[PDB]
Each structure stands twice: as structure tokens, then as C-alpha cells.
């Protein structure tokens with residue numbers, strides 16, 4: 102990806118991605134709009150199992166598109182299982198997509214409603230050995246998506262908000278140990294699920310999406326800080342990191358299943 106030049110601006114944004122990543126117009130692209138009335142309850146869906154008690158965070162990185170909180174995934178320490186999944190999926194990192202305004206920012210939408218942001222906890226299927234091999238498989242990744250709305254602060258998110266000052270620009274990273282991702286989950290684990298893709302290039306169709314119904318609330322001050330990050334590297338013209346979300350894509354031949 103040393104020669105990639107995609108982003109979220111008018112000249113290299115989502116409408117341009119297909120020229121270098123033709124799968125952008127594929128059969129199972131993400132995100133999608135979740136039409137709550139058309140999604141069907143699926144009694145065969147097992148309960149979701151989120152086991153993050155032994156999670157080991159390591160670092161937080163601004164990669165020029167968003168910021169990732171990375172985890173040690175060399176052992177089964179933080180895994181997602183159950184729900185629509187077969188097997189064990191390991192947490193490798195989480196990041197967010199957000200807007201320039203509270204009225205937009207999420208990638209998935211619910212009955213066309215856009216949330217202020219969306220958290221993505223990325224996990225890979227351990228049967229494939231490593232993340233690089235997993236992204237080459239139809240069932241290689243499981244991404245847990247959680248909507249963020251603006252209201253009360255999310256206590257569990259503050260440590261993230263406070264370290265952003267240290268990774269303002271692209272390429273900067275900072276030690277970020279002992280962060281507990283369980284502090285970012287809503288109370289209920291009710292979800293919608295459908296087969297999809299990574300929402301940024303390479304847009305590989307290797308994701309089982311699990312989107313929680315219940316959003317979490319964050320304060321205006323918390324999301325305000327996200328909006329102070331930069332897409333650019335240090336010493337470059339400042340372009341605020343905002344609206345780093347891909348709009349909803351055609352559902353095509355897919356059905357969204359509800360666990361409730």
C-alpha cells in the first residue's frame with residue numbers, strides 16, 4: 102500500500118475508490134443501511150460471546166484515515182464467538198469513523214438514520230492463522246460495530262480521548278497498554294448481522310458484520326476531540342480528520358438477520 106492514494110476528500114473519496122479497487126462495486130460491500138422492518142429475526146442465531154477480560158492493548162496509531170487501538174493477538178486473549186459465527190475470532194484492533202457534525206459520521210445507518218460515529222472492533226478467524234491470511238477468506242473477519250450518539254460521556258472512552266493529543270498526525274503512535282475495550286460496549290448485545298466487506302480499501306469481502314442495536318452515548322467534548330485529529334502528517338497543511346466514513350452501499354442479494 103505504499104502507492105495507495107485514497108482518502109475521504111472530494112478528489113480521492115468513496116466515489117473514486119473503484120478505480121483502484123474495483124471490488125468497490127462488488128456483491129457484498131459495506132456499509133449498508135439496516136432497514137429494521139425488513140431484517141428478520143433468526144431463532145437459530147446463538148447468543149453472542151464477547152470475552153475481553155484478558156485483552157491486552159499495546160498501542161494507539163493515527164494511520165492517516167482513523168486511529169487504531171491495537172491488541173496482542175498472538176494468543177487467544179480477547180475473542181468473539183457465537184452469534185452467527187463458527188469458530189473463534191481474535192480481536193486485533195478497534196477504531197472509529199466519525200463526522201464533522203453530530204448528525205453524521207456512522208457508516209452503517211438504521212432506517213437511514215446516521216449516528217455521530219461508529220466503533221469497529223475488528224476480529225480475525227483463528228482457523229486462518231493470521232490476519233493477513235484471514236482477509237483473503239469470505240469468513241475471515243468478524244467486525245463488531247457499535248453506534249455512538251452524543252449525550253452523556255462514556256467513562257470507558259476517556260483514556261482514548263486523552264491520548265489523542267499525542268498522535269495528532271498521520272504516522273504517529275503512542276504506547277497504549279491496559280486499556281479495557283469492555284468499557285466501550287452498550288448494556289445489550291442484541292444485534293443485526295449480514296455478510297459484507299472492509300469499509301475502506303482494499304474493501305475485501307471477508308467480513309461477517311455484527312452491528313449492535315443499542316448505541317453508546319459519548320459527550321460532545323469527547324467527539325469534539327476526535328475532530329481535532331489530522332489526516333495529514335506532521336509539517337503538512339492541516340486537514341482535520343472528520344467525515345472518515347463510507348456511505349451506505351447497495352444491499353444487493355443479501356438479507357440482514359436480527360438476533361432479537
Ligand SMILES: CC#CCOc1ccc(CNS(N)(=O)=O)cc1
Pocket residue numbers: 105106107108112113114117118119120121122
Ligand atoms: C497532487 C496529486 C495527486 C494525485 O491525486 C489523486 C487523486 C485521486 C486518486 C484516486 N485514488 S483512489 N482510486 O484510490 O481513490 C489518486 C491520486
Ligand SMILES: CC#CCOc1ccc(CNS(N)(=O)=O)cc1
Pocket residue numbers: 221223236244298299300301302303304
Ligand atoms: C490486504 C489488507 C488489509 C488490511 O486492511 C484493512 C482495511 C480496513 C480495516 C478496517 N475495516 S472496517 N472499517 O471495515 O472495520 C482493517 C484492515
Ligand SMILES: [Zn+2]
Pocket residue numbers: 196197198221300
Ligand atoms: Zn471501520
